[PDB]
């Protein structure tokens, strides 16, 4: 992550991120709504950061330092460039909504009143089709990636030294290769939990309550489609094992 965004999302909540004299100007219901929107953006910033660890630290480091056989790095990190493009674009829209809402003279005081429209746009049309295709592929290649990683770590000394070297810093404690893969798979099922809680505190403007209700429905339709499109790939699986599913 870049320092500007890390500092803007360093606090545990929106109520602790804004100036106390700005917080005091708002009703409790607005504070509860903004705390959950802040959690959605903060966790999206961390999710994009997980994808940058996968592309820049692991994937590119293996290509630039190791002698792995062709197609090994793609098997360890399936769809990572596509996932990074989807989420970096979504994060850019969330951060621009926050930035446009800042008070003049402030880099931290803002209220986002219209999140629903942004979520409907993300979870409909081509961007939703791309999310569905990419997660159906990623989640079907998840078990294969974990097994490929375990095999390389157990048999290749240079691969083992590379992993231990780049995961040694304390800031990587939660972000080893297998942990990143599971963090990405679990991201999509966090959205309904966050959207439902934002909706619980967005009844003040009927247009907003309706837009978040529509967005929650689109997210659930996407998850149902992804879940129906998963069949775990296994290295060396025979056709007979597949057609006898």
């Amino acid at each position: 992550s870049m320092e500007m965004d890390e500092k803007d999302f360093a606090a545990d909540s929106w109520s602790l991120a804004v100036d106390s004299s700005f917080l005091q100007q708002h009703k409790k219901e607005v504070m509860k709504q903004q705390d959950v929107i802040y959690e959605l953006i903060q966790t999206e910033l961390h999710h994009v950061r997980t994808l940058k660890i996968m592309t820049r630290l692991f994937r590119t480091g293996m290509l630039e330092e190791l002698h792995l056989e062709p197609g090994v790095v793609q098997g360890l990190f399936p769809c990572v460039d596509e996932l990074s493009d989807i989420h970096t674009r979504f994060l850019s829209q969330l951060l621009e909504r926050r930035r446009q809402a800042l008070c003049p003279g402030s880099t931290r005081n803002f209220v986002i009143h219209r999140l629903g429209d942004l979520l409907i746009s993300q979870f409909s049309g081509p961007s939703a089709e791309q999310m569905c295709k990419t997660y159906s592929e990623f989640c079907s290649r998840h078990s294969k990636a974990l097994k490929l990683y375990k095999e390389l770590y157990a048999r290749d000394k240079r691969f083992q030294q590379f992993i231990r070297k780049v995961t040694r810093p304390a800031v990587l404690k939660r972000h080893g290769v297998q942990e990143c893969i599971l963090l990405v798979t679990q991201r999509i099922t966090k959205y309904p939990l966050l959207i439902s809680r934002i909706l619980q505190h967005s009844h003040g403007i009927e247009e907003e309550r309706q837009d978040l209700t529509t967005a929650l429905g689109l997210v659930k339709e996407l998850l149902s489609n992804v879940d129906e499109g998963i069949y775990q790939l296994e290295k060396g699986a025979r056709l007979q094992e597949i057609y006898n599913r």
């Binding site: 109520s15 602790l16 959690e39 798979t185």
Partner: protein
């Protein structure tokens, strides 16, 4: 330190996310209780042994039968949760959660955990449950269910007061080491 993986499973209202947040946080969440839990790697020393225990939640995956099992690979210990204020969450343990965990995590110890133990003596909870001919889960009902499903053990905790939370994760670490 040896690395071990823990996954918590249970119905949507069981309190699994809150339990992971309260254990992992240094200060109890007095200002904002997070909606979700990403992951965490806890440094735990139990009975003289140092372990890095990776913690994972299945919240949000309850309705997605092909996404949810992706959380299970290489799990060393399962916390199987129900809420004491929800006898319905305990009924779903033996024929939904238990066969799933035994299939995807063969031979992995399961600790059955009764969450929200503070509600056992909460008057609002007792009044609401009494309208559906129910009462908070009794300790013997939790132990009998743990015994029946082949659980490694039965434990109770309250994420709200923190009582029993440290003991649950220290015991999960011991189970993961066996």
């Amino acid at each position: 330190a040896i690395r071990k993986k823990l996954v918590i499973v249970g119905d949507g209202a069981c309190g699994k996310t809150c339990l992971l947040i309260v254990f992992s946080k240094d200060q109890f969440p007095e200002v904002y209780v997070p909606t979700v839990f990403e992951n965490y790697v806890a440094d735990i020393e139990v009975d003289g042994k140092q372990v890095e225990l990776a913690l994972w939640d299945t919240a949000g995956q309850e309705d997605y039968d092909r996404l949810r099992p992706l959380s299970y690979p290489d799990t060393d210990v399962i916390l199987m949760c129900f809420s004491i204020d929800s006898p319905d969450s305990l009924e779903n343990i033996p024929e939904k959660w238990t066969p799933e965990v035994k299939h995807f995590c063969p031979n992995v110890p399961i600790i059955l955990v009764g969450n929200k133990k503070d509600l056992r003596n909460d008057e609002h909870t007792r009044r609401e449950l009494a309208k559906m001919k129910q009462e908070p889960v009794k300790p013997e009902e939790g132990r009998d269910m743990a015994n029946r499903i082949g659980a490694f053990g039965y434990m109770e905790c309250s994420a709200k007061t923190k009582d029993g939370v440290r003991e649950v994760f220290e015991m999960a670490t011991r189970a993961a080491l066996q």
